[PDB]
Curated annotation (Swiss-Prot), chain A:
The gene is folP. (7,8-dihydropterin-6-yl)methyl diphosphate binds at D79, N98, D157, K193, R227, V228, H229. GO terms for molecular function: dihydropteroate synthase activity; metal ion binding. Belongs to the DHPS family. CDD domains: DHPS. This is Dihydropteroate synthase. It comes from Escherichia coli (strain K12).
Length: 249, 252
């Protein structure tokens, strides 16, 4: 199970650490940061600046993708919902459209087909959160298939955070591997999220450990992309989960 | 459901537990390191005076080191206490002073240890150490020492099972055990594991003993999500943090 973008490939045969690059100096404060996270072992960067106008956003997020495409052989993930951004990021060398809104914005769906790139679908918004999020995946995977983006370019993200309380969150985390039925890759972002801040009662700086544990639980069920802030630590932990799932038969 | 019973008190093995490590190699300093682990969540304290090539201590030295420490805890905290020792005197004497778990990494193999672990009606932790299957070899070892114990005074509802992480097992042997670990629940006996800053993290990381925290946290959370009841760590504040999220996914 691989991804294909801008001529290259991503091997989802082992789990993958993606760092976060909120681009909200500036441009140099951005390439410095991505350098480090690549040094840490991030195999994808998640660039993003989000509301704001589509000119503010292009202004910020597009040059940063450019410098990274023309300095490191790392994969590049654009976090945005706007169609201009989708089509311009693709034209510079981005690999994954990452839309938290799931292509919902006017013309974003079509722009995402227009690029031929992998696109990541995340659930957002009766206590069957797993049915709720599965059927949201069953819906959107068809909405995109009608749009003509092949299912083999589709990535699933349950939507940790946002509007879900503690209970719902951890029911998803518990039933993560049940989404493997799609045969589609699973991206997960839980780092420093409130499902760790409430459980551990610590400022946003010190959630590193409850974080790491969410990263391992995900990965032990076969999650393919994990979206974090503390990359060096998550890579190291990801090293020993690969050592574990390789010891199986 | 499982629960461990010693010294007229119990132990809720349903949710996982974090065991700290109190190396005693003074006593003021031991009680201080006890309090901090207790604050950080430690439900058990392992008291220790067991490393390959380390100085052989005497039985006078041991009781000198370890017996005043269990005393200071038993009367100052409500925490459960494990003694890490392999000597019969240290067993009997520490049982007298309010010890809860006997932790013999040499599985009561010293002359008179089995007997001494009988005369004290406390739980004993069995530990495997030392071609076909390292899980097969470990399991047949638990099949053995579970019987030699039962024929001795003690019951099966007193035993703890622990495979042998560290102790010369190579990186795959180590990581294959961590992957078939839930299979040891077939015993229907508590699972205690210890992996903090071991060589399975030291090798696969190419990293010094200090900076194995993240690798260690991971091995704990893999072990916990498979149902290990007790987890032996130096970095306790960090382990109970990770176990809280483990508890949260296991539950909801
Ligand atoms: C704003 C927030 C954050 O960075 O904390 C956030 N932005 N973008 C995201 N994209 C994906 N695929 N999954 C996520 O969880 C996620 C986030 O949580
Ligand atoms: C760090 C040291 C070593 O491996 O040399 C060591 N001492 N005492 C121990 N007791 C239990 N129950 N389990 C263990 O793994 C263990 C150790 O690993």
């Amino acid at each position: 199970m691989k991804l294909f973008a801008q001529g290259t490939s991503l091997d989802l045969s082992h789990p993958h650490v993606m760092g976060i690059l909120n681009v909200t100096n500036s441009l140099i404060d951005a390439v410095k940061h991505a350098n480090l996270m690549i040094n840490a072992g991030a195999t994808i960067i998640d660039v993003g600046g989000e509301e704001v106008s589509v000119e503010e956003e292009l202004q910020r997020v597009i040059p940063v993708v450019e410098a990274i495409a023309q300095r490191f052989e790392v994969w590049i993930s654009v976090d945005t919902s706007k169609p201009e951004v989708i089509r311009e990021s693709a034209k510079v060398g981005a690999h994954i459209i990452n839309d938290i809104r799931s292509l919902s914005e006017p013309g974003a769906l079509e722009a995402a087909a227009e690029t031929g790139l992998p696109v990541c679908l995340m659930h957002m918004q009766y206590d069957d959160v797993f049915a709720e999020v599965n059927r949201y995946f069953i819906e959107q995977i068809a909405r995109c298939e009608q749009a003509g983006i092949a299912k083999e370019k589709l990535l699933l993200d349950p939507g940790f955070g946002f509007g879900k309380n503690l209970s719902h969150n951890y029911s998803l985390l518990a039933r993560l591997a049940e989404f493997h039925h799609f045969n589609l890759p699973l991206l997960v972002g839980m780092s420093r999220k409130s499902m760790i801040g409430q459980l551990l009662n610590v400022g946003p700086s010190e959630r590193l450990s409850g974080s790491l544990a969410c990263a391992v639980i995900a990965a032990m069920q076969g999650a393919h992309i994990i979206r974090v802030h503390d990359v060096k630590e998550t890579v190291e932990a990801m090293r020993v989960v690969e050592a574990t799932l390789s010891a199986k038969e």
